[PDB]
Scaffold this active site. Structure first.
Site, PDB file in Angstrom:
ATOM      1  N   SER A 177       8.765  -4.401  -3.034  1.00 14.25           N
ATOM      2  CA  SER A 177       8.863  -4.064  -1.626  1.00 14.25           C
ATOM      3  C   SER A 177      10.074  -4.671  -0.949  1.00 14.25           C
ATOM      4  CB  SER A 177       7.585  -4.459  -0.887  1.00 14.25           C
ATOM      5  OG  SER A 177       6.516  -3.605  -1.254  1.00 14.25           O
ATOM      6  N   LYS A 221      12.196  -2.118   0.985  1.00 10.14           N
ATOM      7  CA  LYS A 221      11.723  -1.676   2.285  1.00 10.14           C
ATOM      8  C   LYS A 221      12.645  -2.176   3.388  1.00 10.14           C
ATOM      9  CE  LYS A 221       7.084  -0.940   0.643  1.00 10.14           C
ATOM     10  NZ  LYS A 221       5.858  -1.696   0.195  1.00 10.14           N
ATOM     11  N   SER A 276       4.682  -4.708   4.703  1.00 10.80           N
ATOM     12  CA  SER A 276       4.968  -4.180   3.373  1.00 10.80           C
ATOM     13  C   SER A 276       4.063  -2.984   3.017  1.00 10.80           C
ATOM     14  CB  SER A 276       4.869  -5.303   2.347  1.00 10.80           C
ATOM     15  OG  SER A 276       5.210  -4.846   1.054  1.00 10.80           O
ATOM     16  N   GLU A 327       6.766   4.872  -3.507  1.00  9.62           N
ATOM     17  CA  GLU A 327       5.624   4.017  -3.789  1.00  9.62           C
ATOM     18  C   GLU A 327       4.514   4.741  -4.537  1.00  9.62           C
ATOM     19  OE1 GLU A 327       5.772   1.125  -3.971  1.00  9.62           O
ATOM     20  OE2 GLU A 327       6.619   0.050  -2.269  1.00  9.62           O
TER      21      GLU A 327
END
Length: 277
Positions: A44, A47, A108, A144
């Site tokens: 993550s 991100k 997240s 994801e």
């Protein structure tokens, strides 16, 4: 600087993992890097990268911060926690683009994340945006859900320690986003509650730390990725860019997060005795 580099190898020698390190002081011309020739799964962390693209498309009027996004609970992924899928009730709800941004950076969130990927044009759109910052040593090919479907795609959402240093470089200096997009990204990335015992684990209380964690699952006693990348404010309000990516570890979570903290603490301290030299 060949005095700082020594205490890093005492933190990492003997530790059953590949630990990539990036530090870029406020008066250094280049980042100090350890293991820059390997490809480090991001989890993550990217991100942070996506938030830059999504807010850069906001800066250029391609999107709107409170442009609403519709959300069907059926059609989203669900293995991960998603603080979104807990806050809203009912089979369908609308969430602004701003709200999907903060969810995806601080908490997240992987569903808020993928919607941000639909909105911008998918994995390779991010990839292109990363070439656009000048960052050549990074690859972003999957989202994801594809990460949750196959646990080795994560290795293809990779970045080098030099590449981590360049993205953190373009986020610190506010040269890539509007004063409002910058001030919002920092805000979501400073007020995060994630990974308190990583970059912050051995720093003085109250140090502002803008950062984004990244963590993978554990299989057969190995953790593919335990990462925390961010920007640490020194006592004089100057920036210190630190990223630690622990790859494919046969160590505990304490050991994995401590390496991150010790590396940050060595870098934090060194900068504090560097107005000497």
């Amino acid at each position: 600087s060949p005095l700082l580099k020594e205490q890093i190898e005492t933190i990492v020698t003997g530790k059953k993992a590949t630990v990539g390190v990036a530090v870029w002081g406020p008066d250094d011309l280049e980042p100090l890097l350890l293991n820059p020739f390997e490809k480090f799964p991001m989890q993550s962390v990217f991100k942070l990268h996506l938030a830059m693209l999504v807010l850069h498309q906001v800066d250029q009027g391609k999107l709107d911060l409170n442009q609403s996004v519709t959300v069907n609970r059926a059609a989203v992924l669900q293995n991960t926690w998603s603080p979104m899928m807990k806050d809203h009730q009912g089979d369908e709800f609308t969430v602004a683009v701003q709200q999907l941004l903060q969810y995806s950076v601080s908490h997240s969130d992987n569903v808020a994340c993928d919607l941000l990927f639909e909105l911008v044009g998918g994995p390779q759109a991010l990839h292109a945006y990363i070439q656009s910052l000048g960052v050549k040593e990074a690859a972003v090919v999957a989202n994801e859900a594809q990460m949750h479907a196959d646990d080795q795609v994560q290795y293809q959402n990779w970045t080098s320690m030099k590449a981590a240093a360049q993205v953190l470089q373009k986020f610190e200096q506010k040269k890539q986003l509007s004063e409002t997009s910058q001030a919002l990204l920092w805000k979501w990335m400073v007020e995060t509650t994630t990974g308190p015992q990583r970059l912050k684990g051995l720093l003085p209380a109250g140090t502002i730390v803008a950062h984004k964690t990244g963590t993978s699952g554990v299989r057969a006693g190995k953790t593919a990725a335990t990462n925390d990348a961010g920007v640490i404010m020194l006592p004089d309000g100057r920036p210190l860019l630190v990223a630690v990516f622990v790859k494919d570890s046969a160590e505990s979570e304490r050991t994995n997060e401590a390496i991150i903290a010790q590396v940050a603490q060595a870098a934090y301290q060194f900068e504090l005795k560097k107005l000497s030299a």
